[PDB]
Amino acid sequence: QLDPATLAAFSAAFRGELIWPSDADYDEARRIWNGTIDRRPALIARCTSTPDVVAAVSFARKSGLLVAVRGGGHSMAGHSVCDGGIVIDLSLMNSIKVSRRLRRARAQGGCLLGAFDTATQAHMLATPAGVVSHTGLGGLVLGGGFGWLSRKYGLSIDNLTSVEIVTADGGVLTASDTENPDLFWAVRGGGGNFGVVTAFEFDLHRVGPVRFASTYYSLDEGPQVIRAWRDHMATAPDELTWALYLRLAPPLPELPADMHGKPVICAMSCWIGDPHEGERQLESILHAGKPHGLTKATLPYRALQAYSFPGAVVPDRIYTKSGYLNELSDEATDTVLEHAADIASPFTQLELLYLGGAVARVPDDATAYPNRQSPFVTNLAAAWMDPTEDARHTAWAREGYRALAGHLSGGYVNFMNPGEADRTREAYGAAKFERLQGVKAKYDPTNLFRLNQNIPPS
């Protein structure tokens, strides 16, 4: 229960919608993508402008409310909703200005990935983002952000030119390489720790149709497939991106009915470049084993962005255990294959991704993002429906992570699960963490923004 004059003051400054536990659209506004997170915020504040976030940030500050900030609500830690505090919901701020002469896009802090790519591709432009269209932009970009364009153009933070950000004291700041450049260093990898970002500006690149391929390998050929992949990507051009999603086979018509719901290697690849070059390049790598249900297409980039994932089903409940690898040993290959063979839910994926390329040529200390030079990412992403099966699906992800343990180092802040608050120092490393603390003490000394992979101040 809140001081009547202070809410009266907040709401006086707010143009958006307030949702209270007793209102209609409360239960749905407070659900987030990770259905295992069931929290009841004291107030959801769906902001509609930079001034509204200013109002919300200050209200929460002297009311003492715990502050959750919501972009697209895809936090695998469930950070975008709180019990008993305030949700600063940016989901209605999803505008995107795109300048065709500038190759520039100014996007609001609540954009969904697909809204951004729709607007940029109106001029055949694009910049790197994640692969699932309904991910929010805010949480992905603030943690680094990678997808199909990353090997050629870098992380999302590698194409960020500025932010407009609301700091914990209510102020509005511009952060670029020429304005508040400590802050601009922290936001490019340091999550929500330093204020609410209400507008990202990106440099955009011209991306026409990309030649794309998706196929399925039996586990029989599991070794030959993954060893071919790790060897090829060691020397592959930036233009080739190639990923492995180990999963139960989706019951799609392009695959024989006999493999349906059997573990497979789903391999997806594309070529950011001339599709004829992609046609030869992709087929050079498509046949490490016998490809089942081969799909080959020249897609607009926006269609590439909307393709993931085969079967297009939205899981209710989630658990992710992820890490980086400097090299994928044949013993690490045998253990990913033995754990894949025991996947139970039809929505679970053991993803093996190769980064590197443009991401690894950016100097390490340029941004807050860690482990640029570790080129493998592995994500044991459990995803199911039935709440009574929670234990066994998280047990699957826990035990795949443990059996890989020492091969793994660091960690992507945006793949952390709710029980991994203590991974923050080891994900960044002592050096980056300790500089991030220096920025935290300066811009958020009270730690008003602590629902995130949080860096305490000092």
Ligand X SMILES: Cc1cc2nc3c(=O)[nH]c(=O)nc-3n(C[C@H](O)[C@H](O)[C@H](O)COP(=O)(O)OP(=O)(O)OC[C@H]3O[C@@H](n4cnc5c(N)ncnc54)[C@H](O)[C@@H]3O)c2cc1C
- Would you list which residues are annotated within the binding site? 69, 71-75, 80, 109, 131, 136, 139-140, 146, 197, 412, 414, 451
> How many residues sit close enough to a second copy to count as binding (CB under 8 A)?
56
Does residue 370 interact with ligand X by CB under 6 A?
A: no
Minimum distance from CB of 429 to a second copy (Å)? 34
Smaller CB separation from ligand X, 132 or 175 = 132
Residues 418-447 that bind a second copy (CB under 8 A): none
Q: At what angle do helices 4-13 and 50-63 cross, to 10 degrees?
A: 170
Does residue 41 interact with ligand X by CB under 6 A?
A: no
The one-letter amino acid code at 399 reads E
Backbone angles phi, psi at 209, to 5 degrees: -65, 140
Residue 208 contacts residue 129 (beta carbons within 8 Å): no
Rounded-to-integer distance, Cα 427 and Cα 398, Å? 18
Enumerate the H helices of 286-429 as residue ranges.
301-307, 330-340, 358-361, 390-404, 424-428
Rounded-to-integer distance, Cα 293 and Cα 329, Å? 28
Does residue 94 interact with a second copy by CB under 8 A?
A: yes
Does residue 53 interact with a second copy by CB under 8 A?
A: no
Backbone angles phi, psi at 83, to 5 degrees: -90, 125
Minimum distance from CB of 308 to ligand X (Å)? 8
Give which of ligand X, a second copy, none residue 310 binds (C-beta under 5 to 8 Å, depending on kind).
a second copy
Give which of ligand X, a second copy, none residue 451 binds (C-beta under 5 to 8 Å, depending on kind).
ligand X
Smaller CB separation from ligand X, 119 or 288 = 119
Three-state secondary structure string covering 232-243: HHHHCCCCEEEE
**What is the number of other CB atoms lying within 10 angstroms of the CB of residue 213?**
22
Rounded-to-integer distance, Cα 180 and Cα 200, Å? 15
- Contact residue for ligand X among 79, 317, 435, 450 (CB under 6 A): 79
Residue 184 contacts residue 162 (beta carbons within 8 Å): yes
Minimum distance from CB of 79 to a second copy (Å)? 18
Quick one: which H or E segment has residue 126? strand 125-126
Does residue 273 interact with ligand X by CB under 6 A?
A: no
Does residue 146 interact with ligand X by CB under 6 A?
A: yes
- Contact residue for ligand X among 132, 160, 175, 358 (CB under 6 A): 132
Interface stretch with a second copy, choices 180-188, 228-236, 312-320, 355-363 (CB under 8 A): 312-320
* CA-based R_g, the chain, Å: 22
Does residue 358 interact with ligand X by CB under 6 A?
A: no
Does residue 207 interact with ligand X by CB under 6 A?
A: no
Give which of a second copy, ligand X, none residue 146 binds (C-beta under 5 to 8 Å, depending on kind).
ligand X
Give which of a second copy, ligand X, none residue 389 binds (C-beta under 5 to 8 Å, depending on kind).
none
Rounded-to-integer distance, Cα 425 and Cα 300, Å? 40
428 to 25, 75, 180, 186: CA distances (angstroms)? 38, 18, 22, 12
Per-residue contact flags (x/-) with a second copy for residues 272 to 301, judged by CB under 8 A: ---xx-xx---------------xxxxxxx
- Contact residue for a second copy among 8, 13, 234, 312 (CB under 8 A): 312
Minimum distance from CB of 319 to a second copy (Å)? 20
Does residue 129 interact with a second copy by CB under 8 A?
A: no
The one-letter amino acid code at 186 reads A
Per-residue contact flags (x/-) with ligand X for residues 414 to 443, judged by CB under 6 A: x-----------------------------
Smaller CB separation from ligand X, 154 or 222 = 154
Residue 373 contacts residue 360 (beta carbons within 8 Å): yes
Residue 214 contacts residue 310 (beta carbons within 8 Å): yes
Give which of a second copy, ligand X, none residue 113 binds (C-beta under 5 to 8 Å, depending on kind).
a second copy
Minimum distance from CB of 410 to ligand X (Å)? 14
Residue 224 contacts residue 289 (beta carbons within 8 Å): yes
Beta-carbon contacts of residue 127 (< 8 Å; ≥ 6 apart): 105, 120, 149, 153, 156, 159, 202, 203, 204, 205
80 to 38, 114, 213, 353: CA distances (angstroms)? 11, 19, 34, 26
Does residue 117 interact with a second copy by CB under 8 A?
A: yes
- Contact residue for a second copy among 42, 45, 60, 96 (CB under 8 A): 96
Minimum distance from CB of 74 to a second copy (Å)? 10
**What is the number of other CB atoms lying within 10 angstroms of the CB of residue 256?**
12
Beta-carbon contacts of residue 33 (< 8 Å; ≥ 6 apart): 72, 73, 74, 75, 318
Does residue 338 interact with a second copy by CB under 8 A?
A: no
Residues at the site binding a second copy, with contacts judged by CB under 8 A: 15, 25, 28, 48-49, 91-97, 99-101, 112-115, 117-119, 121-124, 133-134, 208-209, 211, 251-254, 275-276, 278-279, 295-303, 305-307, 310-314
